[PDB]
Design a binder for this molecule. Structure first.
Ligand SMILES: CC(=O)N[C@H]1[C@H](OC[C@H]2O[C@H](OCc3ccccc3)[C@H](NC(C)=O)[C@@H](O)[C@@H]2O)O[C@H](CO)[C@@H](O)[C@@H]1O
Ligand code: UDP
Ligand code: MN
Length: 273
């Protein structure tokens, strides 16, 4: 009996002021977000969203960025009228970071909670500056963080697909998900670009003004040195995607914690094989 939410949300206020120089108390954020239900789940009370979105954050040792992420995104995602949940996929151990493998774990695990049909993949340190930048899926894969301050508020190259993106359930399945063997920094987002292009798709984007995005400045994380194999790996995507991704994935979930504003899945994703 509730009617469809309108196509575009009437609640959006467009551009927003974004800053990362004050402390954040998630207790307060939770109290400022009374409609967000345990585990960081929200759907509107007044209408049915067609956007059933699981937002997936690859994570290790960035608690400070996460509280900023939570503080800014939760109110925006509510104004966008999404039926959404947050998933922080926390890499166990202290071995080399694997961004794309976490994202896969995220897709697969989230699906167990709820019938999500859209996946937003978001780095922890990127915050949109305009709530017209929709954190849901389109008829083609969606690149969301299109004009980041750190790249001068434009794309750093036209095939860039890093930062924040969104794939529908079907688009993610169609590329066999993300690669598992990009260990350490660099290039997994280029490989994913390739995967989309090899399956007949193109990149949807908002304009540079709406897609304005802030990156929280930070120094290097240890255990994520540039991957020196990344260039050879991206040159073979077409062949390797056939058997490397969802259909070749295993992991062991160590812990699932429902916090009021996000579900955190701690996971053993292993070391290179
Ligand atoms: C492969 C990689 O390291 N990608 C990074 C990227 O690195 C800087 C790099 O970006 C462009 O090249 C991407 C690329 C894609 C396929 C094969 C080889 C390289 C850029 N190319 C152009 C035409 O402008 C090149 O000049 C640069 O050195 O940086 C981004 C943002 O930090 C990461 O998201 C990628 O993973
Ligand atoms: O030790 C790490 C390495 C990276 N990441 C996650 O992976 C993303 C991408 O890595 P990074 O911030 O280094 O990209 P950069 O800003 O250096 O280009 C981060 O936003 C986090 O979501 C993390 O949580 N812990
Ligand atoms: Mn970063």
């Amino acid at each position: 009996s509730l009617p469809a939410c309108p196509e575009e949300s009437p609640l959006l206020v467009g551009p927003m002021l974004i800053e990362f120089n004050m402390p954040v108390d998630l207790e307060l954020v939770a109290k400022q977000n009374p409609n967000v239900k345990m585990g960081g789940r929200y759907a509107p009370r007044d209408c049915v969203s067609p956007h059933k979105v699981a937002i997936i954050i690859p994570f290790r040792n960035r608690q400070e960025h996460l509280k900023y992420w939570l503080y800014y995104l939760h109110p925006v995602l509510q104004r966008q009228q999404l039926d959404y949940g947050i998933y922080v996929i926390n890499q166990a151990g202290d071995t080399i970071f694997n961004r794309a493998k976490l994202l896969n774990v995220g897709f697969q695990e989230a699906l167990k909670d709820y019938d999500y049909t859209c996946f937003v993949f978001s780095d922890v340190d990127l915050i949109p500056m305009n709530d017209h930048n929709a954190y849901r899926c389109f008829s083609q894969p969606r690149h969301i963080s299109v004009a980041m301050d750190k790249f001068g508020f434009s794309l750093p190259y036209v095939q860039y697909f890093g930062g924040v993106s969104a794939l529908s359930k079907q688009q993610f399945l169609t590329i066999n998900g993300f690669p598992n063997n990009y260990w350490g920094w660099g290039g997994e987002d280029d490989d994913i670009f390739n995967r989309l292009v090899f399956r007949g798709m193109s990149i949807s984007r908002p304009n540079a003004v709406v897609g304005t995005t802030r990156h929280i400045r930070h120094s290097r994380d240890k255990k994520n040195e540039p991957n020196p194999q990344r260039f050879d790996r991206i040159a073979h995507t077409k062949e390797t995607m056939l058997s490397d991704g969802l259909n070749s994935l295993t992991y062991q979930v160590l812990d699932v914690q429902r916090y009021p504003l996000y579900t955190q899945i701690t996971v053993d994703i292993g070391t290179p094989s």
